[PDB]
Design a protein around this ligand. Sequence first.
Ligand code: HEM
Length: 153
Amino acid sequence: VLSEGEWQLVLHVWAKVEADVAGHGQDILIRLFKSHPETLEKFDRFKHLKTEAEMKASEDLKKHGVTVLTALGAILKKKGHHEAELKPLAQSHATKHKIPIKYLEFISEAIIHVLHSRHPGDFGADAQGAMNKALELFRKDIAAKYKELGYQG
Ligand code: HEM
């Protein structure tokens, strides 16, 4: 359970992401894909991208980054009352896209990285800890729905 203080740190930094959702979305997906190449293989859409330059030139990758961050933003702004928003996301990522929970850990790390790079004055250690807790809560609750469906492993 995050506290109200910790939610405020999280959503203070997130409001700054909302000024440039596409740029953030691109940097995070590129970092995920470079740090953890296995994750790119889950996207038939992107698996032709062999260089960081080709990834940064891809409009379709930048489109997907906005889709991911708008959905994450929607869940963060529920401050933990996010069951309606997580159900479909867990359902599709377990059963259709086949994404292990650990790759959700990876993209959490890439999101923390990108926010520290772009918003260092709003993303000190308090706010880093709080964002980590929010992202853990997202992963806990998706993992519980994986388990229900037979995909926690
Ligand atoms: C913050 C974590 C994430 C969020 C909020 C998220 C959000 C989304 C949304 C909103 C969609 C499209 C709607 C849907 O299919 O449910 C999507 C599609 C997809 N996601 Fe995620 N995603 C996350 C993490 C990941 C990770 C870690 C992977 C892969 C490693 C991944 C792989 C996919 C794939 C393969 C699609 C289908 C893309 C396509 O071919 O159109 N997701 N995601």
